Design an enzyme around this catalytic site. Sequence first.
Site, PDB file in Angstrom:
ATOM      1  N   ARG A 125      -0.078   9.186   0.737  1.00  0.00           N
ATOM      2  CA  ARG A 125      -0.857   9.197   1.981  1.00  0.00           C
ATOM      3  C   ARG A 125      -0.228   8.327   3.074  1.00  0.00           C
ATOM      4  O   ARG A 125      -0.520   8.522   4.249  1.00  0.00           O
ATOM      5  CB  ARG A 125      -2.323   8.766   1.748  1.00  0.00           C
ATOM      6  CG  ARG A 125      -2.506   7.347   1.244  1.00  0.00           C
ATOM      7  CD  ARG A 125      -3.967   6.911   1.084  1.00  0.00           C
ATOM      8  NE  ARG A 125      -3.954   5.575   0.508  1.00  0.00           N
ATOM      9  CZ  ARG A 125      -3.829   5.300  -0.787  1.00  0.00           C
ATOM     10  NH1 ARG A 125      -3.807   6.265  -1.690  1.00  0.00           N
ATOM     11  NH2 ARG A 125      -3.758   4.048  -1.192  1.00  0.00           N
ATOM     12  N   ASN A 126       0.590   7.358   2.672  1.00  0.00           N
ATOM     13  CA  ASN A 126       1.136   6.338   3.572  1.00  0.00           C
ATOM     14  C   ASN A 126       2.632   6.490   3.884  1.00  0.00           C
ATOM     15  O   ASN A 126       3.291   5.541   4.302  1.00  0.00           O
ATOM     16  CB  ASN A 126       0.806   4.967   3.016  1.00  0.00           C
ATOM     17  CG  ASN A 126      -0.681   4.673   3.111  1.00  0.00           C
ATOM     18  OD1 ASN A 126      -1.349   5.159   4.025  1.00  0.00           O
ATOM     19  ND2 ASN A 126      -1.208   3.922   2.166  1.00  0.00           N
ATOM     20  N   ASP A 144       2.677   3.230   7.540  1.00  0.00           N
ATOM     21  CA  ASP A 144       1.537   2.391   7.227  1.00  0.00           C
ATOM     22  C   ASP A 144       1.936   0.960   6.894  1.00  0.00           C
ATOM     23  O   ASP A 144       1.503   0.409   5.893  1.00  0.00           O
ATOM     24  CB  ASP A 144       0.730   3.026   6.076  1.00  0.00           C
ATOM     25  CG  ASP A 144      -0.435   2.165   5.644  1.00  0.00           C
ATOM     26  OD1 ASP A 144      -1.238   1.821   6.538  1.00  0.00           O
ATOM     27  OD2 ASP A 144      -0.523   1.824   4.435  1.00  0.00           O
ATOM     28  N   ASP A 190       0.825  -1.220   0.000  1.00  0.00           N
ATOM     29  CA  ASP A 190       0.000   0.000   0.000  1.00  0.00           C
ATOM     30  C   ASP A 190       0.856   1.266   0.000  1.00  0.00           C
ATOM     31  O   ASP A 190       0.533   2.240   0.674  1.00  0.00           O
ATOM     32  CB  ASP A 190      -1.012  -0.011   1.179  1.00  0.00           C
ATOM     33  CG  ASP A 190      -2.105   1.043   1.048  1.00  0.00           C
ATOM     34  OD1 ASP A 190      -2.291   1.656  -0.052  1.00  0.00           O
ATOM     35  OD2 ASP A 190      -2.784   1.289   2.074  1.00  0.00           O
TER      36      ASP A 190
HETATM   37  C1  LIG Z   1      -0.054  16.838  10.986  1.00  0.00           C
HETATM   38  O1  LIG Z   1       0.068  15.626  11.769  1.00  0.00           O
HETATM   39  C2  LIG Z   1      -0.215  15.912  13.167  1.00  0.00           C
HETATM   40  C3  LIG Z   1       0.602  14.993  14.078  1.00  0.00           C
HETATM   41  O2  LIG Z   1      -0.096  13.732  14.223  1.00  0.00           O
HETATM   42  C4  LIG Z   1       0.582  12.563  14.064  1.00  0.00           C
HETATM   43  C5  LIG Z   1       1.943  12.432  14.318  1.00  0.00           C
HETATM   44  N1  LIG Z   1       2.552  11.259  14.155  1.00  0.00           N
HETATM   45  C6  LIG Z   1       1.883  10.165  13.753  1.00  0.00           C
HETATM   46  C7  LIG Z   1       2.547   8.963  13.582  1.00  0.00           C
HETATM   47  C8  LIG Z   1       1.838   7.836  13.162  1.00  0.00           C
HETATM   48  C9  LIG Z   1       0.466   7.891  12.898  1.00  0.00           C
HETATM   49  C10 LIG Z   1      -0.269   6.612  12.442  1.00  0.00           C
HETATM   50  C11 LIG Z   1       0.004   5.486  13.461  1.00  0.00           C
HETATM   51  C12 LIG Z   1       0.288   6.246  11.068  1.00  0.00           C
HETATM   52  N2  LIG Z   1       1.231   5.357  10.777  1.00  0.00           N
HETATM   53  N3  LIG Z   1       1.440   5.350   9.547  1.00  0.00           N
HETATM   54  C13 LIG Z   1       0.668   6.235   8.931  1.00  0.00           C
HETATM   55  C14 LIG Z   1       0.521   6.614   7.600  1.00  0.00           C
HETATM   56  F1  LIG Z   1       1.284   6.019   6.660  1.00  0.00           F
HETATM   57  C15 LIG Z   1      -0.406   7.594   7.263  1.00  0.00           C
HETATM   58  C16 LIG Z   1      -1.181   8.202   8.242  1.00  0.00           C
HETATM   59  C17 LIG Z   1      -2.149   9.137   7.937  1.00  0.00           C
HETATM   60  C18 LIG Z   1      -2.613   9.603   6.759  1.00  0.00           C
HETATM   61  C19 LIG Z   1      -3.618  10.436   7.060  1.00  0.00           C
HETATM   62  C20 LIG Z   1      -4.452  11.261   6.075  1.00  0.00           C
HETATM   63  N4  LIG Z   1      -3.832  10.485   8.373  1.00  0.00           N
HETATM   64  O3  LIG Z   1      -2.893   9.636   8.968  1.00  0.00           O
HETATM   65  C21 LIG Z   1      -1.052   7.819   9.584  1.00  0.00           C
HETATM   66  N5  LIG Z   1      -0.105   6.858   9.902  1.00  0.00           N
HETATM   67  C22 LIG Z   1      -0.201   9.096  13.058  1.00  0.00           C
HETATM   68  C23 LIG Z   1       0.509  10.230  13.486  1.00  0.00           C
HETATM   69  C24 LIG Z   1      -0.138  11.447  13.647  1.00  0.00           C
END
Ligand SMILES: COCCOc1cnc2ccc([C@H](C)c3nnc4c(F)cc(-c5cc(C)no5)cn34)cc2c1
Length: 290
Positions: free
Chosen positions: A152-153, A166, A148
């Site tokens: 976005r990922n 992701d 994937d």
């Molecule tokens: C602007 O961002 C604000 C900060 O929020 C965060 C910070 N770090 C993060 C780290 C990992 C994640 C989750 C676990 C995550 N892990 N891999 C991904 C990824 F490949 C994509 C995204 C993602 C895409 C979208 C749209 N929203 O979340 C979220 N992901 C979310 C976070 C959000």
Amino acid sequence: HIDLSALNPELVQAVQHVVIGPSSLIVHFNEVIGRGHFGCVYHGTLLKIHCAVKSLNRITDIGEVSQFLTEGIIMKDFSHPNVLSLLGICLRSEGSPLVVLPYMKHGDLRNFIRNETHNPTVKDLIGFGLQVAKGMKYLASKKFVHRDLAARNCMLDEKFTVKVADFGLARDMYDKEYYSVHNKTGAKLPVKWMALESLQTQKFTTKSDVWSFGVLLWELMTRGAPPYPDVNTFDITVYLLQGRRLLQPEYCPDPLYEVMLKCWHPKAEMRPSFSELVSRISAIFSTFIG
Ligand SMILES: COCCOc1cnc2ccc([C@H](C)c3nnc4c(F)cc(-c5cc(C)no5)cn34)cc2c1
């Protein structure tokens, strides 16, 4: 409850290094910073390092706990500056485990390039592509197929380092728009990022990740435009088979477009390796100033 007997005995030693004691982690459930299909994510502080803590409670059942741990152990062993790392797993009495990831200040790559407040140059955008290529070179060397890859990922940290994300325990659908339900299998597939053969078989390889990478480069060079907007879901196979590819974006250099076309080669085995992509893109990147 962690049952060490249940694990592959060679992995038992690794468990102490993946599991985070609840005392060492504070989660700030007061505000959601992210949303996936499988759960929300929150600010967290780990012993003081800022982290992203993902809940998995939106899933009805987590599955075999032995397997969940094995996934974490495998994932924690990965270490590369262009790959999102696993800090660990924290076990809470009431509910599923928390997945603990480094905090990514600048969020996902697609939203970052779509953001009016930031203005990456063509060189910067190519450099994001290169970083993704290096992360994928690493993952491919570990015989790991992502399945994937898309803008976005991938996520960006405070230094604008791009990390392929992701995967493993952070795997989710983070933008539901781009996943379509297969009618025979019921699988929700990112069809507009998928290689021809995967659309046909639903089998994913490193060479199908290479196809997705081609698409990701197109996303970078269009600053996050949706690919094939005037094509609907699984009609993408028919569209591609008419002899069609994504068009060259205005500011995409010609050699970078040639790279994209190689990534979409009809024969999976003729697509470039991620090592080759790193080489070719580093050269293109080097020709730019600013
Ligand atoms: C602007 O961002 C604000 C900060 O929020 C965060 C910070 N770090 C993060 C780290 C990992 C994640 C989750 C676990 C995550 N892990 N891999 C991904 C990824 F490949 C994509 C995204 C993602 C895409 C979208 C749209 N929203 O979340 C979220 N992901 C979310 C976070 C959000």
